[PDB]
Amino acid sequence: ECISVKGRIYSILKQIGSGGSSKVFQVLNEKKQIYAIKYVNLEEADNQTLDSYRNEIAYLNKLQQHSDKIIRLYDYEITDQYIYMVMECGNIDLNSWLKKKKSIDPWERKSYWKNMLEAVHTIHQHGIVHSDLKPANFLIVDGMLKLIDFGIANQMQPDVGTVNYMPPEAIKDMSISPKSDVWSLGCILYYMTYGKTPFQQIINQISKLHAIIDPNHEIEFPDIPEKDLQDVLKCCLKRDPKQRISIPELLAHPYVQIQT
Numbered sequence: 001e002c003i004s005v006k007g008r009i010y011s012i013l014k015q016i017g018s019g020g021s022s023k024v025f026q027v028l029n030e031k032k033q034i035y036a037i038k039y040v041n042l043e044e045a046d047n048q049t050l051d052s053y054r055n056e057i058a059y060l061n062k063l064q065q066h067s068d069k070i071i072r073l074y075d076y077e078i079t080d081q082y083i084y085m086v087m088e089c090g091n092i093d094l095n096s097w098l099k100k101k102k103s104i105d106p107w108e109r110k111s112y113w114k115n116m117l118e119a120v121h122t123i124h125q126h127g128i129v130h131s132d133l134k135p136a137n138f139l140i141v142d143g144m145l146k147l148i149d150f151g152i153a154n155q156m157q158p159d160v161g162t163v164n165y166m167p168p169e170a171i172k173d174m175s176i177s178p179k180s181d182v183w184s185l186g187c188i189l190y191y192m193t194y195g196k197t198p199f200q201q202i203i204n205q206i207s208k209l210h211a212i213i214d215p216n217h218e219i220e221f222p223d224i225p226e227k228d229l230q231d232v233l234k235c236c237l238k239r240d241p242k243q244r245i246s247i248p249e250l251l252a253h254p255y256v257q258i259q260t
């Protein structure tokens, strides 16, 4: 099996992930180098799908001029029938590496943190709010964390979703803020520090949504050595969006700034 994209030929090692219409494969180029290719079959596709897929290709194009922490889009073929995106290839997604129930070198966790902030800050700077960041949204390449889905299109799953990372304003605002990504980054850090996400314990997802949106519900923050990390997690995970810490604040925080 093979894939010709904008004149170049790539051979399919392994499918890595799937989506609605999409498939992402790990492939080699004519020079036995690693890439990822995302395939989207557009034959069946509303114009909103079409429009969403179009948008983020463009945003991905611009956005990678501004940050190493966004995965690169080398090339793309697009026609009325399919999309091919030749992209830099991750090693695995944060959500799989996390579930290799490991424990994290405290200075890799700090560097991964730095990485998510850089990347989310970048999309924020060009007007994007993911409002659904999860570990699946991050790839590990060269001991960096790089972002892949800007939450715009029909997002993929690496080869059932999740709601521990839902910002309370997301639950409340059903009957957007950049601060709602701080929350989900919050849960991913919390997860990364305490081996579990905040309300990961309320296993019935009605009672879990309430907890998230519930004032006299208390997230537990077990004391730990890096008390700066404890403060970050504590200000990320405030229920009041206006009381929650901004991304530009987080970037001026002792946790990322002082080399402990």
Ligand SMILES: CNc1nc(Nc2ccc(N3CCCC3=O)cc2OC)nc2[nH]cc(C#N)c12
Binding pocket: 016, 017, 024, 026, 036, 038, 071, 087, 088, 089, 090, 091, 092, 093, 096, 139, 148, 156, 157, 158, 159
């Ligand atoms: C998920 N989509 C992507 N995935 C990867 N890498 C990768 C991700 C996951 C895994 N898994 C998953 C469980 C077992 C295992 O190995 C393996 C992987 O590499 C072989 N690189 C990418 N670049 C652009 C992408 C898009 N869109 C993209």
